Design a binder for this molecule. Structure first.
Ligand SMILES: OC[C@H]1CNC[C@@H](O)[C@H]1O
Length: 802
């Protein structure tokens, strides 16, 4: 029967608890909460925790406990529990019996609890112990049961979870052939004659094909099944049409369906051409991808369907069409949303392999030898049916790149992926030049994944023509929303602990996106890129605190810098100037964007740089009505400083992807006019804002589901009387939520603050703050949101829960 959520009614408590694995245990005073849950985001921030991991308590022992009772109708039934993810080093007990011991924190695991249950109707206790260690992550991991949990009651004859595998070996205009595999389990102590039905269902519920198999299952047995079906005139899954079928497996026993298993099916042709990029359904699709870490800003590492959906919507708005799950298996909700939103996925399994990355002594390296096979296979088993997945990845910047025998591990890992999923190619984030060429790791990979090697694309492709190449990790330029430093120079750090939004500051291994656009244009055989990153994430405050490839783990010299600056948007999804630069390269809808803002009272009469990003042909800049020149994109190049790790002769790059003026600052307004074919196609005006005066609220969604999980992201802006955003506003805004909802978190994208994420107040960060309102489960009605700040006009908005 169909599973239910197991998230409700848990107990939680930090520290060591001897005897907490036993049913009889004094947990009466333990804190009550529902899952998913991430205790590290609750803080507080402490300088004793490395800013590389966000300066939050992402390690230490903690326990979860849940009391649950099953109906008396569960007698003679199978009962299984699935944890989609637990961070990290998880041990699970059922009525004192140990059932799970899984170190990997990004993988889903399932465990049969039928042998350990008490009698139907009597209470059961499940105990979860997590023991994450310090010095184990290069970014913020969070801590706790951060992914959803599930309980399923099944017939003793049922389909094994994650063993159903479907693919399309042959696709023509007339038909698609569907290869099928499944495993049925018979946990009965006698033989069971059953019929295993396998149906392909359209979205409208039409059985477009069906086969069956009469079989006698031996007692306490497993039976593998292979079938082949046909879909006539199949509606393809595509970036422009994410249509999916459904494969339904039914265990029929004595004429009655006793178990029903469903998996998704997307019909699409994938082809990787070594000299012509990536092809989807017989046409080339340029990979315009972004890397994302798993956390959700103020929500921490917890999964939330709406938060993930919102991130994918904002990345698609930027023009992105692909996501790389850096550097770990994603939640099932992310992959499900990517299926329905037509987003191509590169699902990555590991960060490091067995050799530790510098100063990360407690990472996955300690478990790699024992767990790499099961963890890699389980990631593939869980997501091989999702049509959004177009390739697997086995690692990222692994230390084995400079080992003589490092290629053997890559070959062995790739062999495991090919065995579990023979239908997809495998890539790997290569970074140590020229080691990954000299020592043969790149030779072993299906797809050569290059990290920050754009200026080497031509040389590498000419020496190895038959290689399939992608930029697995590109740029890594950093910036802070609303921050501008003058003059535009390539410094290393700033006193403000923020980075200029003119997008020129790069770590020694990094470069500006212009250099990636240029080398992707000059080497069209490369299928595309995955930028680092699409969203800001907690931890790795580079250039502050430290650099990833150093041998020092504590990054607290620049405290309280604890969040990243690699993102094209900030921690809550506010668009940086970087967002519009990528929109100028990845979208076709006419747009124009200008930076910086026009509030510089200490610059009257002085010269100031002005940048314009557009996908149009020309842009003319106006300052208080006076034209400052009509520039032509691609012809009037912008000289920007660079510093390339493996090419020290290059000091500057003349980018044809930006436009620059240098004008005298006078308060008033600026305006950019975008021209294509000598006619106006886009206009953007930015006025000098007056004194801060009022609050403006912008909910992205006003209609929410009353499920207790749906969220509304309410943009909070500090403006003047005319509504112009005050670029430097830092007012403390107070929030009140009445009705069928409540505050769940707040943020503002500030990378160097210790302000709480769980509070009813938040400072504006360069004019903007974010209030996350959550629905309440089972109560529908109005949700009234009020924002207040002293010396400003308050604001109110009304939402509705259904
Ligand atoms: O520029 C920072 C990136 C370097 N490459 C690995 C990523 O996870 C991240 O640390």
């Amino acid at each position: 029967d169909d599973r239910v959520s197991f998230n409700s009614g848990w107990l939680f408590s930090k520290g060591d608890h001897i005897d907490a694995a036993k049913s009889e245990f004094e947990d009466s005073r333990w804190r009550k909460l529902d899952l998913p849950h991430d205790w590290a985001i609750e803080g507080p921030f402490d300088k004793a925790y490395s800013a590389r991991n966000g300066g939050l308590p992402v390690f230490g022992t903690a326990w979860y406990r849940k009391h649950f009772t099953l109906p008396k109708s569960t007698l003679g039934k199978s009962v299984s529990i699935t944890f989609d993810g637990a961070m990290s080093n998880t041990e699970v007990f059922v009525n004192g019996n140990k059932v799970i011991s899984r170190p990997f924190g990004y993988i889903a695991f399932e465990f049969d609890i039928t042998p350990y249950l008490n009698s139907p109707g009597d209470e059961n206790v499940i105990s979860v112990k997590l023991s994450p260690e310090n010095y184990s992550a290069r970014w913020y991991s969070g801590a706790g049961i951060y992914r959803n949990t599930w309980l399923e009651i099944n017939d003793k004859v049922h389909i094994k979870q994650w063993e159903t595998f479907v693919s399309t070996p042959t696709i023509t205009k007339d038909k698609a052939i569907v290869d099928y595999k499944t495993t049925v389990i018979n946990t009965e102590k006698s033989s069971q004659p059953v019929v295993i039905k396998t149906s392909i269902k359209s979205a409208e519920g039409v059985v477009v094909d069906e086969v069956a198999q009469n079989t006698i299952l031996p007692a306490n047995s497993e039976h593998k099944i292979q079938q082949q079906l046909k879909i006539s005139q199949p509606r393809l899954w595509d970036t422009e049409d994410p249509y999916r079928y459904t494969v339904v497996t039914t265990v029929v026993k004595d004429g009655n369906a006793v178990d029903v298993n469903s998996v998704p099916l997307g019909v699409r042709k994938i082809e990787f051409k070594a000299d012509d990029g990536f092809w989807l359904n017989d046409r080339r699709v340029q990979i315009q991808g972004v890397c994302l870490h798993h956390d959700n800003g103020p929500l921490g590492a917890i999964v939330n369907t709406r938060a993930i959906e919102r991130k994918l919507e904002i990345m698609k708005e930027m023009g992105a069409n692909s996501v790389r799950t850096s550097h770990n298996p994603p939640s099932p909700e992310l992959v499900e949303l990517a299926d329905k939103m037509g987003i191509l996925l590169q699902v990555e399994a590991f960060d490091m392999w067995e050799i530790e990355k510098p100063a990360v002594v407690n990472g996955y390296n300690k478990d790699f030898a024992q767990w790499h096979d099961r963890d890699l296979r389980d990631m593939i088993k869980q997501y091989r049916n999702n049509p959004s997945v177009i390739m697997w990845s086995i690692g990222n910047e692994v230390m084995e790149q400079r080992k003589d025998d490092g290629w053997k591990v890559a070959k062995n890992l790739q062999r495991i992926a090919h065995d579990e999923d023979p239908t997809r190619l495998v890539t790997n984030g290569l970074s140590m030049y020229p080691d990954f060429i000299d020592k043969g790791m790149a030779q072993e990979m299906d797809i050569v994944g290059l990290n920050y090697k754009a200026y080497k694309y031509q040389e590498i492709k000419q020496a190895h023509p038959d290689w399939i190449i992608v930029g697995t990790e590109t740029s890594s330029v950093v910036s802070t929303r609303g921050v501008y430093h003058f003059p535009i120079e390539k410094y290393n750090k700033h006193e403000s602990k923020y980075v200029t939004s003119f997008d020129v500051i790069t770590p020694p291994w990094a470069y500006i996106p212009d250099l990636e656009f240029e080398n992707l244009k000059n080497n069209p055989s490369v299928m595309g890129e995955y930028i680092w990153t699409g969203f800001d994430y907690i931890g790795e405050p580079t250039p502050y605190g430290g650099r990833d490839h150093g041998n020092k783990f504590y990054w607290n010299q620049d405290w309280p810098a604890r969040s990243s600056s690699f993102g094209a948007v900030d921690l809550v999804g506010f668009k940086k100037d970087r967002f519009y630069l990528y929109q100028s390269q990845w979208t076709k809808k006419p747009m124009v964007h200008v930076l910086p803002h026009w509030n510089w009272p200490e610059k009257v009469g002085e010269t100031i740089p002005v940048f314009a990003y557009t996908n149009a042909e020309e842009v003319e800049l106006f300052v208080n009505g006076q034209s400052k020149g009509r520039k032509r994109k691609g012809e009037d190049k912008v000289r920007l400083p660079v510093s390339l790790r493996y090419d020290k002769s290059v000091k500057y790059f003349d980018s044809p992807y930006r436009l620059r003026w240098d004008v005298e600052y006078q308060p008033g307004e600026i305006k950019v006019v975008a021209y294509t074919n000598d006619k106006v196609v886009s206009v953007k005006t930015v006025k000098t804002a007056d004194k801060a005066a009022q609050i403006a609220l912008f909910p992205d969604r006003k209609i929410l589901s009353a499920d207790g999980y749906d969220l509304s992201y309410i943009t909070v802006e500090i403006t003047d009387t005319d509504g112009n955003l005050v670029p430097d506003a830092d007012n403390k805004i107070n929030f009140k939520v009445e009705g069928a909802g409540e505050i769940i978190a707040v943020g503002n994208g500030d990378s160097a603050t210790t302000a709480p994420f769980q509070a009813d107040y938040r400072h504006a960060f360069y004019g903007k703050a974010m209030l996350i309102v959550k629905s309440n489960k089972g109560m529908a009605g109005e949700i009234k949101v009020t924002a207040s700040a002293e010396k400003l006009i308050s604001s109110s908005v009304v939402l509705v829960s259904q």
